[PDB]
Design a protein around this ligand. Structure first.
Ligand SMILES: CC(=O)N[C@H]1/C(=N/O)O[C@H](CO)[C@@H](O)[C@@H]1O[C@@H]1O[C@H](CO)[C@H](O)[C@H](O)[C@H]1O
Length: 636
């Protein structure tokens, strides 16, 4: 008896007329439905290039570099003639009928692996499938051809980077993941740091700087992603009106809510419009999302008779508070249209009116199925996006955890509106669908834990919005392929934990302890820092909060009994002590390290006394002590 003789097949690079008939075709997400099988197969190998026109050079260079990393083969970009050993990129704008604005074709055969798109984004999206097919350990691909384009125009996520801050590094990863998945839509509820003297008191954290937004919008756009801002109004306004009580709506007894804009006050409405004009400069999108959810949550219009008075003055006798509410939406619509934008709102903004009618040119993003039902809005001719609660995650609300298995197995599609209410999935004004990623009480899960949790659901929505098919017999078959496919390169490369666990001197922390400090890593990519003097661990635990997270600029860290940072998000009873003890360490360009509270995403710094922020007007940490600050205030 001899051994098995097991040896690597080791196929020659390029095309082979020979291939086994049932050689695996590596899976992609979205699936590429209706593959026509050809004869033979193609092998990426030594000498394989990505060849394109000059105009596509950047795309080709980026793909070659990526494939060199995934495959361990030296893959270079080139122009001119392609050979069978090569991947070719072609932009053919005459193919819009076949491929539309985002679709692509693959031809794999004796000419090599051709990717054709009718647009730059179409070519890019084809390259995503090439990357997915070649990064699963198999470098031979069955020959044949396929053409694919998305069923729906808008495919993506709501990312509420709201009250709490989602780090710009997280956002960059998220955009890379969306691009891999051919998702082209992110509604970003967020604060752009307000700078002019009618709005500047609202520069409380979370915020994003202009430069930061410009940077991730540029990244998004290169990936084919429309980044739509949202400033929710006239409800959910606390982060904007806390410092502007003059714009808050008072109830009949005179009690103001920082969450409610007074839409009867024209200076309040101008404040909102001023924000829109500030955002105009850094987002490129042609849309504005004003929210309009949950204005009267926890209460009722009966408690705000001044809105009835206003309605009657503004929109005539018999007008109701719902009329005034809808009139504010229509006024914002008029405003943003004049800037070249289309308005979007949440469906719970569609209320029963009398004197005023909602403008039909506003996109309705449908999440709440107790309102006006989906089929009714179809009958009326509104433009609809499916933002079902079935596709929500919350850090704190366990009612909101997407169950991709259940949706896959129960036959959900993009026409399945909230509460399992079906409309015709071919409705000609159905734009698409999206998952939604909400922080709510934010200490239960770190952003890195959110990243791990959303993985499956992001693949699910990608599949259902592009392909609208279930080529895997069950969800578990899908799951196995999505896991083989894995994350895109940028996620695999991100240095979550750039320093080794060990003992460190940290001079920035001398106001807390002379140290040294013992650092250990956590499963979610953070550190716990134990002071070897006291035996306690560093926490960012105390200060003013939004969403139960310390948002206070200039809050100081403290030593607390060491929490167990090795456990997962199911340990909800200890979450706050645990997550307030997690620290993100980042390396500079080049080589210096910054320490950030994992939950806050501010940066530790030594306070100079010259940092300028509204929070620091009324409390400053002692000068020279260590405290957290937004990165922009400590960028010195
Ligand atoms: C449109 C929407 O879903 N509104 C709120 C909601 N109602 O059930 O559910 C989610 C999930 O729990 C909430 O997060 C939504 O509210 C939003 O909260 C964030 C903070 O998490 C923010 O204030 C935003 O303005 C608000 O819409």
């Amino acid at each position: 008896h001899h051994s098995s003789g097991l040896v690597p097949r080791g196929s020659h690079m390029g095309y082979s007329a020979t291939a086994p008939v049932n050689l695996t075709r590596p899976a992609t997400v979205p699936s590429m439905d209706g593959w026509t099988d050809g004869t033979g197969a193609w092998t990426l190998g030594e000498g394989t290039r990505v060849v394109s026109s000059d105009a596509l050079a950047a795309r080709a260079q980026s793909l070659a570099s990526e494939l060199t990393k995934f495959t361990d083969v030296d893959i270079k970009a080139a122009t001119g003639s392609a050979t069978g050993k090569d991947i070719s990129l072609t932009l053919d704008a005459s193919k819009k009928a076949e491929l539309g604005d985002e679709g692509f074709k693959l031809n794999i055969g004796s000419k090599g692996l051709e990717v054709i798109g009718a647009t730059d984004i179409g070519v890019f999206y084809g390259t995503r499938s090439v990357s997915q097919m070649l990064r699963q350990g198999q470098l031979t691909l069955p020959a044949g051809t396929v053409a694919t384009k998305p069923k729906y125009k808008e495919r993506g996520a709501t990312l509420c980077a709201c009250q709490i801050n989602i780090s710009t590094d997280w956002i960059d990863r998220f955009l890379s993941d969306m691009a891999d998945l051919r998702l082209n839509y992110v509604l970003l509820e967020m604060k752009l740091k307000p700078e002019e003297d009618n709005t500047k008191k609202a520069a409380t954290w979370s915020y994003y700087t202009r430069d930061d937004v410009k940077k991730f919008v540029k990244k998004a756009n290169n990936y084919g992603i429309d980044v739509i801002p949202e400033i929710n109004s006239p409800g959910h306004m606390n982060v904007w009106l806390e410092n502007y009580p003059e714009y808050q709506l008072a109830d009949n007894s005179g009690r103001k809510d920082p969450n409610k804009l007074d839409i009867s006050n024209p200076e309040a409405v101008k404040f909102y419009k001023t924000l829109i004009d500030e955002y105009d400069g850094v987002f490129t999108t042609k849309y504005w999302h004003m929210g309009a959810d949950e204005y009267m949550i926890g209460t009722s219009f009966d408690n705000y008779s001044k809105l009835k008075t206003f309605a009657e003055k503004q929109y005539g006798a018999g007008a109701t508070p719902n009329d005034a509410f809808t009139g504010f939406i229509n006024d914002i619509d008029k405003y943003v249209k004049a800037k070249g934008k289309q308005l979007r709102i949440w469906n719970d903004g569609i209320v029963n009116t009398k004197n005023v009618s909602l403008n039909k040119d506003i996109v309705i993003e449908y999440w709440y199925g107790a309102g006006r039902k989906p089929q009714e809005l179809v009958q009326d001719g509104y433009t609809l996006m499916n933002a079902t609660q079935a596709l929500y995650w919350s850090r704190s609300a366990q009612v909101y955890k997407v169950n991709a298995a259940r949706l896959y197995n129960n036959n959900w599609n993009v026409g399945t509106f909230d509460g399992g209410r079906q409309i015709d999935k071919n409705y000609d004004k159905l734009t698409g669908a999206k998952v939604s990623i909400w922080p709510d009480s934010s200490y239960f899960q770190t952003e890195n834990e959110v990243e791990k949790e959303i993985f499956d659901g992001m693949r699910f929505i990608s599949q259902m919005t592009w392909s609208d098919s279930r080529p895997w017999a069950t969800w578990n078959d899908m799951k196995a392929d999505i896991d083989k496919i894995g994350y895109p390169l940028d996620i695999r490369e991100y240095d979550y934990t750039p320093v080794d666990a060990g003992i460190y001197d940290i001079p920035q922390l001398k106001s807390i302890s002379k140290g040294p400090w013992e650092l250990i890593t956590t499963p979610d990519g953070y550190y716990q820092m134990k002071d070897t003097v006291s035996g306690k661990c560093l926490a960012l635990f105390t200060g003013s909060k939004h969403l139960d997270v310390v948002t206070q600029v200039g809050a100081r860290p403290e030593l607390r009994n060491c929490a167990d940072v090795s456990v997962g998000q199911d340990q909800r009873n200890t979450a706050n002590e645990r997550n307030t003890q997690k620290w993100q360490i980042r390396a500079d360009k080049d080589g210096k390290y910054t320490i950030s509270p994992a939950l806050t995403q501010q940066r530790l710094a030594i306070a100079t006394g010259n940092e300028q922020n509204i929070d620091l007007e009324t409390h400053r940490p002692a000068a020279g002590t260590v405290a957290q600050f937004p990165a922009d205030l400590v960028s010195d």
